[PDB]
Amino acid sequence: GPPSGKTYMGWWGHMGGPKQKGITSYAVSPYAQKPLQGIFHNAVFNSFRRFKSQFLYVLIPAGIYWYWWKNGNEYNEFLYSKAGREELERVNV
Amino acid sequence: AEVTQLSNGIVVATEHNPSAHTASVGVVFGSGAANENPYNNGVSNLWKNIFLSKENSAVAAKEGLALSSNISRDFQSYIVSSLPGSTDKSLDFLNQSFIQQKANLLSSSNFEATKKSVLKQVQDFEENDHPNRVLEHLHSTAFQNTPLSLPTRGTLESLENLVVADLESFANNHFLNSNAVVVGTGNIKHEDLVNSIESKNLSLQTGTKPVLKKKAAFLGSEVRLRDDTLPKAWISLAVEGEPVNSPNYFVAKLAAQIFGSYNAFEPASRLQGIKLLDNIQEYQLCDNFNHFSLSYKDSGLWGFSTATRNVTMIDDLIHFTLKQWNRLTISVTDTEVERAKSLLKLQLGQLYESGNPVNDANLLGAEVLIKGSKLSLGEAFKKIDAITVKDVKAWAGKRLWDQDIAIAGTGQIEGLLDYMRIRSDMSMMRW
């Protein structure tokens, strides 16, 4: 077939990054390691900072929208009761 | 062909050959690079170049003598060679320069010049000799934190901290009478050597060497040294093998002879009776390979090394080689075993019957230090002839099928896949 266009990823042996020189890596077989050494030292301290260094970007927008919905629901409940009957004709104009 | 061992306090071994035109006499010690620690690594390689230094070689050359020395993982030797009529001068030179006096060799002017020459050799080894330094890195990852991992030359970082007092401390612990064998090869008779030693009263030192506490142990691991400015890829891979004094010592050497060696540019190497060569030559998957079976006092390594310019098809080369290793458990044929028997006998006969008495002195001394005697070539041929197909299948089911591996590599090794893809090829999910 015809050759393709120019991309930003290749294949094994010609992947297309920069040239590497001076880096050594080491690894050990999984058959020679301890079986399942995580629930502790990861539920102790690791799985608390991973979201509570991030919790303030979620809960400030969540508290704004929950305050807005709860305030509007109590005002609709007041308007259709007996005590809020006089305001109801005023705001449906 | 006969060896003769005799002890009178000193173990003396000979191998007489009245057809040779030279003689060779030396001493072999039973300590190597596996008796060092990570802080004095390279102290054996410094003792070799002190013995081969210029002023020591000049005293020998006025007599007509030549000097050799070899450093391995389990032993080291110091050898003098001469004409057959002057073995008394060669035994005198071994007494004066190496046993009695060592303050002549260990002067400050001679030590600093020798240490400069050794540091340049190790630096040129680490930059240019790519097949042999990958095999050195295979030993250090397979036996990590264990005495069998230290390189025989030492490292550049450990060699510069060495002083004269480090070499004298190693010599007082290992250069002993209970660690030594006096050898003689070529044209020299046995009773002429033991009467020349007994006409003096040679003795190095009384006592035994230190005992190390950690024994060798194989660990499945890998080390990658990627260098994209080199033109090839160099890879070694092995499992845990057999030590010396193993009952499966000759069966492991025959299994490596089945797959053998290869050179893509030699025309007769392309016509060998190896079934792996059908897959490799179809797309030219490599330039050369060779299989090995190394043995030491406590452990060993069985595997292969290879060099490749086809860097996008590296994963096909490892996959085809490991699928042929599976056949040693399942479906190895009787005609492959008979071919490997004849080629192992030709290879062993060329190693032990070369015409070099220096090669014979290294082989004889290393075997008497471990076993206490030497196995003849006639008795080694009869053990090879008795191996059956069922012996090969029982050995490979223990050492090869579903076992851990060790990998080392340098150069353009981006196409080499990670550990678990290669580890899963050590079994077929067919049987």
Side-chain angles (χ1 to χ4, degrees):
Chain A
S4 65
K6 192 262 182 183
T7 66
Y8 289 99
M9 195 191 62
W11 211 249
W12 299 105
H14 53 284
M15 199 66 66
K19 285 194 174 205
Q20 301 186 25
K21 194 174 157 74
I23 304 176
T24 316
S25 51
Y26 305 90
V28 181
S29 176
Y31 287 95
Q33 296 188 43
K34 289 182 174 101
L36 177 63
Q37 223 240 309
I39 180 67
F40 311 74
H41 196 275
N42 206 114
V44 178
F45 287 159
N46 193 12
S47 66
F48 212 68
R49 293 182 183 174
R50 275 176 59 206
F51 198 55
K52 299 295 182 289
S53 178
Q54 188 64 40
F55 80 109
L56 198 65
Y57 305 105
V58 187
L59 296 155
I60 296 189
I64 288 167
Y65 272 87
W66 200 77
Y67 174 81
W68 191 19
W69 162 251
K70 195 202 170 190
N71 191 256
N73 209 52
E74 297 165 341
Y75 183 55
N76 181 86
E77 186 181 3
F78 170 77
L79 281 173
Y80 284 94
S81 85
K82 278 160 83 62
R85 192 191 47 92
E86 292 292 325
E87 187 174 30
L88 187 66
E89 297 98 9
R90 188 186 67 83
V91 304
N92 283 298
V93 168
Chain B
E2 185 68 33
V3 310
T4 309
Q5 277 74 244
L6 191 147
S7 162
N8 47 7
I10 300 165
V11 182
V12 175
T14 46
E15 213 157 359
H16 181 230
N17 188 10
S19 67
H21 293 107
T22 58
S24 162
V25 158
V27 58
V28 190
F29 292 108
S31 312
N35 294 262
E36 313 173 330
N37 57 67
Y39 303 121
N40 63 349
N41 190 31
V43 70
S44 308
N45 194 24
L46 276 186
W47 263 120
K48 157 181 169 186
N49 289 267
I50 283 293
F51 178 73
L52 296 174
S53 46
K54 184 174 172 65
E55 186 62 292
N56 206 38
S57 307
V59 167
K62 288 184 285 293
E63 305 273 80
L65 321 168
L67 309 179
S68 293
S69 175
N70 182 74
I71 306 290
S72 293
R73 284 187 144 87
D74 281 328
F75 67 97
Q76 53 196 97
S77 55
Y78 302 91
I79 296 173
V80 189
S81 296
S82 82
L83 284 185
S86 66
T87 59
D88 292 330
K89 291 136 62 66
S90 72
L91 201 59
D92 181 65
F93 179 79
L94 214 59
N95 188 23
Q96 316 298 323
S97 293
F98 202 53
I99 303 305
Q100 293 293 107
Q101 288 130 32
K102 288 190 284 187
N104 315 336
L105 289 166
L106 288 187
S107 66
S108 177
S109 180
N110 198 37
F111 176 73
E112 298 292 325
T114 306
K115 190 180 168 170
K116 261 165 57 70
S117 193
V118 171
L119 275 164
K120 188 179 186 294
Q121 291 162 28
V122 180
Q123 190 171 351
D124 291 334
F125 174 79
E126 207 57 46
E127 273 146 40
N128 309 131
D129 198 357
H130 307 312
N132 284 330
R133 81 190 177 92
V134 164
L135 192 68
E136 276 286 335
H137 274 99
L138 182 72
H139 282 80
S140 67
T141 192
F143 302 116
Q144 52 185 265
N145 313 109
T146 276
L148 218 54
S149 69
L150 300 171
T152 60
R153 294 161 181 91
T155 63
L156 289 184
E157 293 83 0
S158 180
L159 272 159
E160 302 212 49
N161 279 353
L162 288 168
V163 293
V164 165
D166 279 294
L167 274 73
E168 292 178 352
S169 183
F170 190 84
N172 289 334
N173 290 322
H174 297 273
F175 291 168
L176 314 174
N177 185 53
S178 60
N179 208 29
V181 169
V182 180
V183 293
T185 48
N187 202 335
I188 171 173
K189 292 174 74 173
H190 180 89
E191 280 300 311
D192 277 312
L193 183 54
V194 305
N195 299 138
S196 295
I197 300 179
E198 281 197 346
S199 277
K200 326 161 202 208
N201 295 278
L202 282 78
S203 81
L204 279 87
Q205 202 271 331
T206 313
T208 67
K209 68 168 171 181
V211 173
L212 281 77
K213 298 286 103 176
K214 287 194 81 173
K215 193 179 183 294
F218 188 87
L219 181 68
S221 293
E222 56 168 359
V223 51
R224 293 169 196 247
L225 303 99
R226 182 165 160 176
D227 200 336
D228 283 339
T229 67
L230 298 181
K232 296 192 196 72
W234 293 267
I235 293 164
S236 293
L237 194 150
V239 299
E240 187 193 1
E242 309 290 329
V244 186
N245 297 296
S246 178
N248 288 321
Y249 172 78
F250 284 112
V251 193
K253 286 163 88 80
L254 186 134
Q257 194 61 254
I258 291 181
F259 306 109
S261 298
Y262 171 61
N263 192 343
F265 303 105
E266 287 291 329
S269 179
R270 299 176 65 89
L271 307 173
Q272 294 172 100
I274 302 157
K275 295 192 193 300
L276 176 59
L277 297 182
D278 289 331
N279 293 121
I280 285 175
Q281 300 181 309
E282 199 179 316
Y283 279 109
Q284 197 63 77
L285 289 183
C286 75
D287 272 355
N288 51 77
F289 62 82
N290 64 289
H291 280 76
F292 52 85
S293 173
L294 308 168
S295 292
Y296 305 106
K297 204 190 297 190
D298 285 288
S299 192
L301 286 171
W302 192 98
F304 85 120
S305 305
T306 182
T308 311
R309 274 176 303 119
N310 196 348
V311 291
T312 54
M313 299 180 76
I314 289 180
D315 64 315
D316 276 318
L317 175 64
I318 310 293
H319 176 74
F320 277 133
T321 304
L322 260 52
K323 291 294 114 178
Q324 289 289 138
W325 292 2
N326 289 338
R327 298 184 56 240
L328 286 187
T329 308
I330 292 182
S331 64
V332 57
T333 79
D334 187 87
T335 179
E336 296 178 84
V337 176
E338 299 305 310
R339 176 197 171 268
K341 273 171 167 177
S342 294
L343 292 179
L344 183 58
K345 268 143 77 177
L346 178 66
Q347 193 252 304
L348 256 54
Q350 278 174 109
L351 182 82
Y352 286 100
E353 309 182 306
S354 63
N356 196 8
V358 175
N359 286 343
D360 301 334
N362 284 322
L363 286 156
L364 171 65
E367 291 170 350
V368 173
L369 275 162
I370 290 182
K371 299 179 180 185
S373 63
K374 193 202 179 189
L375 193 78
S376 77
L377 200 55
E379 293 176 309
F381 274 19
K382 291 187 285 185
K383 294 160 177 284
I384 294 165
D385 284 324
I387 301 174
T388 77
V389 167
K390 277 184 174 182
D391 290 346
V392 170
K393 280 178 174 181
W395 175 84
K398 181 212 176 181
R399 294 291 197 192
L400 282 181
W401 190 269
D402 208 57
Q403 296 290 328
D404 265 350
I405 54 174
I407 319 164
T410 201
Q412 295 187 50
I413 48 166
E414 190 210 273
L416 180 69
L417 295 188
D418 76 296
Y419 188 84
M420 283 313 285
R421 273 287 287 261
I422 309 174
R423 172 63 172 84
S424 74
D425 264 354
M426 298 301 286
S427 291
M428 305 158 58
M429 64 176 274
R430 297 83 198 168
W431 292 22

